[PDB]
Subunit: 267 residues, 6 copies
């Protein structure tokens, strides 16, 4: 079968849109414009991309990005076989060859100008240089490049270069408003609505502590964790300590603050 069939999103992933990012991604795709998704960790960027891959009926090749990621990781390599020499394409190369969506997750993790590899794939005529193979690929007309990164979570030297930034269209994601986020919790875990709202208020409290002892507030992912634990019958206070507090802080006082909020919420 096709090497891309394993990258197909089979069952529809649940995604709750916050604003018009679905239709706008479809517009970007119809114009084959590269897409950049920005936001804090755990606000549904990858699940958004994955939902779009489902809706467009396109295979999704996701690459998790490194600090030790060289240009080499993405493109492909020469395998020395008993047969004696065969070439094997990398993820980005497969996507570029057969019109798949390539999703560079946490692109800004990689060293900045290790990431200038994607520039030829964003020119008006999109190409991919496999210079170790000696091949010049013309990118499949249906190929779509998507990148993701958490702004402020990386160095200014590790930040995306302007030359790279200005090759993309962009969406800025943030954690959903209280109602939408509660709805996500309820849909994902089946936890009671009012309980979901309570969890969300705890998250709101931590997120309000951003810049005041926390580098980042509580993500939606951790709320999902807390709800999942509760649904398995874990005591609410324990679940929230375990999922919402211990992961994000080592500071004893911030911990005390969050735990007090939790104990005020769940008596």
């Amino acid at each position: 079968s096709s090497i891309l069939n394993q990258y197909l999103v089979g069952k529809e992933p649940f995604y709750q849109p916050q604003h018009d990012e679905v239709a706008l991604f479809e517009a970007a795709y119809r114009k084959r414009l590269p897409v950049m998704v920005k936001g804090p960790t755990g606000c549904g960027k990858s699940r958004f991309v994955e939902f779009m891959a489902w809706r467009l009926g396109k295979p999704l090749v996701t690459v998790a990005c490194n600090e030790d990621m060289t240009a080499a990781d993405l493109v492909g390599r020469w395998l020395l076989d008993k047969d004696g020499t065969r070439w094997q394409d990398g993820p980005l190369t497969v996507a570029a060859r057969y019109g798949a969506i390539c999703y560079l997750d946490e692109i800004v993790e990689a060293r900045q100008d290790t990431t200038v590899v994607i520039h030829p794939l964003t020119d008006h005529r999109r190409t991919l240089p496999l210079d170790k193979k000696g091949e010049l690929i013309r990118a499949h007309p249906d190929f779509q490049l998507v990148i993701s990164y958490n702004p402020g979570y990386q160095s200014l030297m590790k930040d995306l270069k302007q030359s790279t930034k200005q090759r993309f269209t962009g969406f800025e994601f943030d954690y959903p408003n209280a109602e939408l986020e509660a709805g996500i919790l309820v849909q994902e875990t089946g936890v009671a609505p009012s309980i979901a709202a309570q969890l969300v208020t705890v998250a709101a409290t931590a997120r309000r502590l951003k810049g005041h002892g926390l580098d980042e507030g509580i993500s939606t992912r951790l709320l999902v964790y807390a709800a999942m634990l509760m649904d398995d019958g874990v005591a609410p206070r324990a679940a929230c300590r375990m999922a919402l507090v211990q992961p994000i802080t080592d500071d004893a006082d911030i911990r005390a603050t969050l735990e007090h909020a939790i104990d005020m919420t769940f008596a």
Copy 2:
């Protein structure tokens, strides 16, 4: 036999719970949520994980984590044989393939975004990219990811990224209270109870010197060492100098302080 049989915990490891971490780990596991254990060195984190692996009847694949650990160490490699080419899975890959617990011990030792390798293994659909093999593994439904690290014992640049932190549930371990720690000493070494309490008071004294000449107080492991030495008939003052003082400090005055405490305790 199964390649995992060597990773089975055979005999029940002695673990003394401090609070409800056993049942809560079982809850995390039933939901297949990644688990993070935080605490100072020698407070029983690895033995906790190992006890859980025993109680769950799961094989335990432990990886000791490096500063020179690349993404490469974990996944696996191509072996050039006389036969001519065979692939061999790494530890994490074996665990991910056949539903074992993979325990990344001292995860925060590794360069931060060398550690973003585990992100795909924490998505709602858990996968493991062997891109040097060209294989996309779907993680075994019983696979469980556990990491451990000592907060404050590493650089802020070497610290776990928020993107990684917020993918885990968390337990914070600390050294046990006096009675429990004494009980651990007695169970592990057979040393007399009152002597165990005395050792624990020396440890309490050093741990009170944390931030005042010591980077970290005396761990439970060193107390176990001291008790073991005494049980072999080493003089108490010598045993305590040897196990509780010399390992943790080079400062002559801190050494004098700890040795005075010891000599006040063991006349």
Copy 3:
């Protein structure tokens, strides 16, 4: 066929000259003088080079430049085949062998004295040392060296060395004046002229914020993106947020400023 035929520019690329850079590039070429194109990102440097390659009827071998680019990337290598040993030329070497234009795009990305590789190709007698092959190439009489870089977008240590700088003739590009840039938008996307002017005023507003919260103003490339999106029926305010604002800033206040400008322009 010739290994250079794939590097031929087939269809005439649309380029709008700002001043006399076409004829002056032709003069540099007739004298075989190396050419350096300087300017901010997205001001048509690569498309200029590409247009010249079309007009001169020369193949264009473009290399996108790295931070991890070693001297090795450019020249070529030894391939271990089942046959048993064959050499394969790199891009620069092919261009130097058969009189093609070699275009080092973002040359200043690479480590400075990794870039002193091109010095022998700029002597009065132009040579290319393949010292790993043991070959001394005399550069084809029609070979032309072109480099590109964004000044100020790189480190002073990463900057081009004087020894390298003073081996080139130079063009300084900037974003076109309002009318010319509008004309480019209209030609490239078919967007209405007055709308093109409006987009350009938004770009002017951002470019005026350079040094006051922005590292670089809005490039022509992003204006093209915005126009393309509008032409696909995206709402003007959404298109401009998506193409002109989100890519270039993470600052909430700069974002507010640009978005206010946009909403003042497109009611």
Copy 4:
């Protein structure tokens, strides 16, 4: 014969105990506890370890530790033979396999978390992961781990991590008192007792200059050198300049001070 026979200490090495380190090392060994020897250079740490290896009748595998020492140096590797593929164990692996004493000399030289390799060999169940071979070794019940390092002679970043420190029992060595050190000189070189005392007073003088122009005083090893030279008929003043002064300082004034002390001692 056994691969360990070459690591046997054959003839009894002369070691002069300062306090009860012999019996205490025997106690640590009977409990299979890892041992750490701390002290300045040339105070007999390695000769102590070597004497214990002689007295215990154990082979001694000594590894001199690097700044460029990776985890790789210690464990072993795959050799590509004409035969076609054989594995060869490293020093630590041989020691761990067949119950030898492995002595990591100057362990703190190596990058700190390159040295966390020895953690599995210090767990209550001692194992050695050869993950490049795919083998999990259970450490021989008679295997004994000993490390050595000079405190203050290395960076705080290069210093032993607390996680590593708190896995060892510890001895702190210092240069012997005057009489014992003289006795060592006499035993090792056959130099006259009163002369040995004189040499020792010169060493005392330099060691008193520690922190006042010297990073470290004169070691016992250099005293041995001076005595050896004198015994070969070198003039005392020349011998002391050559062995006790020139090796430890480049400062002309410190040199003048030490040389004046020497000339006051040896007229």
Copy 5:
């Protein structure tokens, strides 16, 4: 034919001596003393060396020096052939074997003690250690070592070590006086004498701005470029902007100054 025949300077290169460097280089050569040429970029150092190689009738092996240049680049390597193993000499090794002039151009680019490779080739008995081949070469009696570098154009840490500096005799080149430099322009390009003088005054103006907004004034090479462009019929103001201004500065005000000088010179 001889592997050195390709390194022969065939046609006499035009070199205009400034002072007695020809005869003095001949004296250094007759004594086989290593030669060091110092000066700013584009003042004819390489063409001087090349002229001497012509006049002495010696082949010239030139090596362009790197920041990524290891000791390895210079000496040679083992090639794995289908035949199965052959050795191939590097440039320096060929020169050292058969009495050629080896010219390390921009030697100070390389990491300082990567450059201590040439020390054995400067001893009274000149040798070249190929320790990867296992060969000790005795340098050909006619071998001559020449190095070149731009002082102040490199780091103080990247600067030549004193140990290396004090192994060479030395010439300090600077840009020629007005008349000589004009003469060079006229000889090289056939541009009119008075025009050549005008170009030289522009260069004088920029070179006077050294330390006042310019890191280095206009080199002779760029003057040659300007003259060449003019000779091809490029407008004088355009030629001078293109060759003398754009290459050496990104500062808008320095650019304005130089352009004003040019427009004052060429009305």
Copy 6:
């Protein structure tokens, strides 16, 4: 023939002793004590070592030391042959095997704890671990280790570690007094005695400028260069500019000072 015959010093090298370093080196050798030679560049350290190798009738294996020197350079390696696998010893290993003098020239160039490789070769029982070969060499009873370095010419971090320093006996060389240095010039070049004295006064003048604009004064080697040039009929002022001034300074004023001294000396 013996692999060491090429390392034999055949003809007696001219060395002028300054004090009793010959007999003292013979004493160190009779006791097999490692020797360290310290001094500025060009004061005859290597020629001293070479003279001792001649007088002792020992082969001399000299290694020039790197900043990129790893532990690997010294010991040896595995060669993949058509035959299929042979081992080849490195320089240090050959010397250690067959009782040659191994001379690590500029040892302090190498990274400090890359240089702790020589520690086992300085123990009372001298061994050499070839752990990549799996061999433990017992050093030949006639093996002699000599190192050389220029104090102050390297970083404090690049400086020799105390652990390494205190394993050697030591000689401190400085440039000879006026008469002896003149005598060296006369013997080496045949230049007239009074002229030799004049050259030496110029060197004295520069050496007096040490710390006042010069990092190091004029070495004896450069004086030899100047004398050699004069003997070939180079004008004294030109010879001294060329050999004594241009190599050691880029400062125009220091240059003026030295040149004035020269012109005062040689009218």
